[PDB]
């Protein structure tokens, strides 16, 4: 009867930020004690909601989005932020209600000689809407000269990979990020905390 938070936080595999995973959670009691009892999270930021209210309140659905970014990009997973990740990969709404959790995963997501599996979108015509997931791989026309679906002049593949090496600086090391979103629609709420 417990919510599958372990399935998200302890997942062996993590998605690239541009193709971020979303886990819909419903019909369970949510044990948030396991989360803030830990000391392994370098980031734990809550907007519009608190662990006390998390303990008592109930929500129609809660979403757990997870992905991997580098160290100094974690500041971009927040309302009203700009940058490659916020604008082109994962945007949070200005009225975001939820919590952002991130921890260093240099031990897992970095490989000797560099781990290039994790991708991010470097180029996009416009900014992502909140909670938008763009998995397009079309060539990006940076200028006026057209790209005929090919690597023409000023035309580039939009997705580029992090070069995650174990010896990278902290701001460039891989960080696993989990974003919890809590929505309360005008319908019976199936996600409840222990204090209810």
């Amino acid at each position, epitope marked *: 009867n417990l919510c599958p938070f372990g399935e998200v936080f302890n997942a062996t595999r993590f998605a690239s930020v541009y193709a971020w995973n979303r886990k819909r959670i419903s019909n369970c009691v949510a044990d948030y004690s396991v989360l803030y009892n830990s000391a392994s999270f370098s980031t734990f930021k809550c907007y519009g909601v608190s662990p006390t209210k998390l303990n008592d309140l109930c929500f129609t659905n809660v979403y757990a989005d997870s992905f991997v970014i580098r160290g100094d990009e974690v500041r*971009q997973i927040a309302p009203g932020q700009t940058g490659k990740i916020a604008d082109y990969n994962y945007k949070l709404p200005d009225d975001f209600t939820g919590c952002v959790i991130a921890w260093n995963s240099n031990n897992l997501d970095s490989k000797v000689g560099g781990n290039y599996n994790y991708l991010y979108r470097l180029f996009r015509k416009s900014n992502l809407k909140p909670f938008e997931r763009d998995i397009s791989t079309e060539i990006y026309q940076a*200028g006026s*000269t057209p790209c005929n679906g090919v690597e023409g002049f*000023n035309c*580039y*593949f939009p997705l580029q990979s992090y070069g995650f090496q174990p010896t990278n*600086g902290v701001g460039y090391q891989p960080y696993r990020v989990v974003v919890l979103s809590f929505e309360l629609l005008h319908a019976p709420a199936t996600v409840c905390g222990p204090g209810s």
Partner: antibody
Amino acid sequence: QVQLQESGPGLVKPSETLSLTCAVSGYSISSGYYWGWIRQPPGKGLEYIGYFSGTTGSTYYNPSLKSRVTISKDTSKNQFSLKLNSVTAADTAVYYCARQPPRFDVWGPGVLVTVST
Amino acid sequence: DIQMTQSPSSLSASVGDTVTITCRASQGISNFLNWYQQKPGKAPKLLIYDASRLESGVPSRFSGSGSGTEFTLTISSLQPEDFATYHCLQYDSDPFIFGPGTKVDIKR
């Protein structure tokens, strides 16, 4: 965590071939991104030379410099080169190797190459 | 070749001032404009791309605007570290073209 380092002599005679090498550390060139060269004559503005795709090798050159310039990625050394034929006093400049041509975000410190007899 | 020019080309200002640098193109380049900061003995550093998008890690006092053939760079609350040479770049046509550069120095 990606660093660029130019290498090569600052000693080239007129009508000879200038040869420079950019050493990339912290990221494998062939894995991704695009890489190129920029130069700046002392006391003048910057000039674009060319760039290539790490993954595919697709190469582009400044039309005013074509037929003189060649950029190639070395095999099994993670570096790319610049070759400029028949240099003149107009080719004396500080030469930079840079990443992401459209928006040059990462630069090498630059090496001054003086063309003289 | 699209020719890029910078109007000020030299100016002096004091810490805490606001300055505006103008860069023009010989023809329409939409918003395919980059702004760079170069200090002596150093490579340029990217500041603004797409003529308004401020790069990550750059203070918000830098701002770019413009479209077509005219663009401007604005620096508010000038700080000592902001004094350097600034360049503009167009990526609309096959030869990437930079401006001549504009040098800002401390008023005294």
